[PDB]
Structures are given as structure tokens and as C-alpha cells.
Amino acid sequence: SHGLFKKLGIPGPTPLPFLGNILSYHKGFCMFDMECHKKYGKVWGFYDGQQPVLAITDPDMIKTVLVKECYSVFTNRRPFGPVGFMKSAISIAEDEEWKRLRSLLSPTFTSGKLKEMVPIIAQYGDVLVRNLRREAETGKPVTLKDVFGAYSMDVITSTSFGVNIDSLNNPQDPFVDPFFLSITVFPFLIPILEVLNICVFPREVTNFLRKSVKRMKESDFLQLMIDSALSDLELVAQSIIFIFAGYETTSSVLSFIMYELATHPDVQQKLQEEIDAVLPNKAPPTYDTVLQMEYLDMVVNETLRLFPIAMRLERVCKKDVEINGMFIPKGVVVMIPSYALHRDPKYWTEPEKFLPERFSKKNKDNIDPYIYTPFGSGPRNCIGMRFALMNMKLALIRVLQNFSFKPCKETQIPLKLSLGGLLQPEKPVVLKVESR
């Protein structure tokens, strides 16, 4: 079906047999979407192997796909690799099976349940200072992904189950393209690996959590789920997605934020002045305190514009439909390039620069909510959106109250992204930390 986009009148790169357009991923995932958006315009198509993928940039077509016709056509994402038992994961699940998981897990991410976890995750904000006060008084560059990754991992274990550890102080068992590139080009190898108990995840784990959730089902995220019903294998499958999310997401974004604050001291100083103004004399941050700091929100929102760790938003077309005046055949994965839309002169002035004033209450009104979608949109959006921003800002407040950040001789200026498809820096961010 390599002539589908050419028989529909949709431009795009010429695909190769079997391979399709995956050879154009040598520059990276984001560079491929920006080049295709530059030479093809608002709509183009390419092939991930034999699978056709359609990209859209029009805000009305994106609104129709993600918000309007979500339950009817664009309900699921594309199926990937051997999932093993993980089929029941809310993000892997499809159709009405997901609608039950989305509903049974929606109360866990409410405006009231989030405030319950504020006194818990604020404790690790004090622990992060202790590990910082040790790596700052030692007076030498510090790798941010380790300290932030430890904070995020301890926040996960306490808010998911309630296990209080110090992932940085006890580094003995803190839990935690080849095989799969051939999987995308050869989708007919997925069922064979499923019948052989082979999973993309290291399947020998999971059974740890499958048996770790035993003393808890006899006497946070977990307590607010079993009480009602969810299965035992489902309950472990959902907790694996909650760990994979809150770890790599919170760790990578915080490292991206501290890079911009260290490379723009005018933004870090203005942010530290607002934090000290709302919280005088290193006051503890509360739920209502975080929702008040607007410049802190402007810094978080602008960094997510530059580095949306999702990169892409994918939806599977369930039936032959016609949205906003164009036909889409059944089986085509409709992709929304979030990275390419965030760095486009059509909607952003100086898209390569870091200007937090783009999200000021005066300028936040002239921003299309479907061009800037770091958490997706519609029913299939990020269920842990409000939980993520609260955990990151609570860490940002406690960190900036005691320390400042300056670049180092090893700091990569400018910063280069990873060559893979994790949206992490090429080299781990290292900065100089000084105590106030």
C-alpha cells in the first residue's frame, strides 16, 4: 500500500519497499517532522514500514481528531510490539476497555485527591535539599538526572504505594534500535513473540511488582483503586505505566528547566524573587501556593514548548471518514507532530529562543490550544497532567529557595538532543550549584 498517499493527492517522501520512510529517521524523530512540515505544508504522509501515517497541522483538524470524533474514530493509538499481559494498560487498552480504565482511574487524579499528596511529596522536597546540600557543599558539578531521578522515583513509590525510600542514598535495589526497529518494519512478528511469552519489557520484572503488591492487598494511588472491580494482573499492569510515566517525565523536564534557568539568569533571578515573595523566608509550599505563582507556570509552560517529551500524538482511524474536507481510509494512523508545531514561525516568534513572557496572562490568550498540546487533548489526553505539574513545581520551589545554578565547563552550550527517540539531552546536564 505504498501508493495510498499518492492516490489520495497527499504529498510526502517517496517510500522504499518494506522499509518505507524509517531510513529518514537518521536525523531523528523531531528533525524528520520539521523537514516534512517545511517542504510539504499543512498535510503530508509517510510510511513506518508498510503502515501508512498521516500528519496534520491544521488546528481544526487536530481538534476534530482528538476532541470531537474521539470516541467514534480516533479512540486508540497504534499497537506496538509484543505487550504480553500489558495489553490491559490504560494507554495500551483500546475502545470500551479503555473507557472503563479511564473512568475507574479518573478519581485518582482529581482536584481534591491531588491536595492529599501535597504534604507527602513536599517531604521529598526536603530530602532533595539534603542530597543537594551534600553535592553543593562539596563544590563540584552535579548531574541533574540523578538527583531529580531520585526525587521522582521516591515521589512515585510514596504516592503510588507508600514506600518511603531514598533512591539516591540506597542505590542497591531502587527498583527500575535493534529488537524493535525490526518489529516496526515487520509487524507480522508480534504474534509469534506473544505466544512465546516474550515481551518488549524485560518480562522477568513485573512479577516482582505482581508479588510486591501482596502485603498491601491485605492491610496513595494504590489505596484509591482496590477499595471497590479491577483484576490483580490489571492492577499491576496499571501501576507499571504510572511508574514509567512519573519517572522519565518528571526527571527529564526538570533537567530541561534547570538548563534554561542556568543559561538565562534573568529568568532564574525573577523566578527566585517570586518564590521568596509568595513564600517569605523559605516558607513551605502548599497546594494553593503553587497555583498562585504565575511566572513559575510561565517557566514550566515555555520549557514544555521547547521540549515536549511526547513529540507525537497518534490516533488510529477506525473507519472511513472525512474530516474538514479530506478523506482518510481505515487503518491509517493519524499523527500530530507536537514538536514541529511548537517551533513554527506561523504561531511562535523566535521559536528557537526561550522567552517565558509568551505565556504571560496578557500573551496567554493569543496561543492556539491545539498547536500547544504537551499533554494531548480530548478523552485520551494525559490523565496525570495536573499531577505532573504539581510534582515538578513543588520541587522547583524547594530547590530554588536554597540554591542557585550556573553553567559549567562541561555544560553543553548550545544543548543537543538525544539521537534516539527519548527526548533527553545528548549529554547529561551538569551545572554549578551555589548555596544562598
R_g over Cα of the chain: 22
Quick check: 301 binds ligand HEM (CB under 6 A)? no
Q: Given the rule CB under 8 A, which residues bind a copy of itself? A: 188, 191-192, 195
Edge-to-edge strand order for the sheet containing 142-143?
142-143, 430-435, 403-407
Closer CB to ligand HEM, 145 or 432, in the complex: 145
Determine contact, residues 213/96, Cβ cutoff 8 Å: no
**Residue 382 assigned ligand-binding role:** yes
H helical segments located in 352-427: 385-400
We find the least distance from the C-beta atom of residue 11 to ligand HEM, in angstroms, to be 25
Among 165, 309, 355, 417, binds ligand HEM (CB under 6 A): 309
Q: What are phi and psi of 179, to 5 degrees?
A: -55, -30
Burial (CB count <10 Å: 0-12, 13-18, 19+), residue 211: exposed
CA distance 115 to 113: 5
We find the least distance from the C-beta atom of residue 187 to a copy of itself, in angstroms, to be 8
Where does this chain touch ligand HEM (CB under 6 A) — which range of 1-9, 120-128, 130-138, 244-252?
Answer: 244-252
We find the least distance from the C-beta atom of residue 191 to a copy of itself, in angstroms, to be 5
We find the least distance from the C-beta atom of residue 8 to a copy of itself, in angstroms, to be 17
Q: Which does 192 bind (CB under 5 to 8 A by kind): a copy of itself, ligand HEM, none?
A: a copy of itself
Closer CB to ligand HEM, 275 or 300, in the complex: 300
Quick check: 149 binds ligand HEM (CB under 6 A)? no
Instruction: Please give the angle made by the CA atoms of 185, 9 and 327, to the nearest 5 degrees.
Output: 85
Quick check: 245 binds ligand HEM (CB under 6 A)? yes
Closer CB to ligand HEM, 402 or 418, in the complex: 418
Which of 297, 281, 312, 260 has the alpha carbon at shortest distance from 392?
297
Among 43, 128, 382, 400, binds ligand HEM (CB under 6 A): 382
Joined together, the cell numbers standing for residue 339 give 514538536
We find the least distance from the C-beta atom of residue 374 to ligand HEM, in angstroms, to be 5
String of contacts with ligand HEM for each residue 253-282, x by CB under 6 A: x-----------------------------
Q: Which does 195 bind (CB under 5 to 8 A by kind): a copy of itself, ligand HEM, none?
A: a copy of itself
Quick check: 387 binds ligand HEM (CB under 6 A)? yes
Determine contact, residues 423/252, Cβ cutoff 8 Å: yes
Quick check: 102 binds ligand HEM (CB under 6 A)? yes
We find the least distance from the C-beta atom of residue 88 to a copy of itself, in angstroms, to be 14
Quick check: 316 binds ligand HEM (CB under 6 A)? no
Determine contact, residues 318/72, Cβ cutoff 8 Å: yes
Partnered with residue 41 across adjacent β-strands are none
We find the least distance from the C-beta atom of residue 99 to a copy of itself, in angstroms, to be 14
Q: Which does 191 bind (CB under 5 to 8 A by kind): ligand HEM, a copy of itself, none?
A: a copy of itself
Instruction: Reduce the DSSP state of residue 405 to 3 states and report it.
Output: strand
From the DSSP assignment, how many helices (H) and strands (E) are in the chain?
A: 17, 9
**What is the b/e burial string over 342-369, where b = at least 16 CB atoms within 10 angstroms of the residue's CB?**
bbbeeebeeeeebbbebbeeeeeeeeee
**Considering only residues 58-97, where is the footprint of ligand HEM by CB under 6 A?**
66, 90-91
Q: Which helix (H) or strand (E) holds 184?
A: helix 181-185
We find the least distance from the C-beta atom of residue 82 to a copy of itself, in angstroms, to be 12
CA distance 297 to 295: 5
Q: Residue for cell digits 518489529?
A: 183
Determine contact, residues 35/44, Cβ cutoff 8 Å: no
We find the least distance from the C-beta atom of residue 290 to ligand HEM, in angstroms, to be 15
Q: Residue for cell digits 531523528?
A: 28
The DSSP output letter for 354 is -
Total site size for ligand HEM, rule CB under 6 A: 25
Closer CB to a copy of itself, 176 or 192, in the complex: 192
Q: Tell me, rounded to whole angstroms, the distance of Cα 26 from its chain centroid.
A: 22
Q: Which does 375 bind (CB under 5 to 8 A by kind): a copy of itself, ligand HEM, none?
A: ligand HEM
Q: Which does 430 bind (CB under 5 to 8 A by kind): a copy of itself, ligand HEM, none?
A: none
Which of 254, 285, 280 has the alpha carbon at shortest distance from 397?
285
Annotated binding-site residues read: 382
Annotated binding-site residues for heme read: 382
- Residues that bind ligand HEM in the complex, under the rule CB under 6 A: 66, 90-91, 98, 102, 241-242, 245-246, 249, 253, 309-310, 313, 374-377, 380-384, 387-388
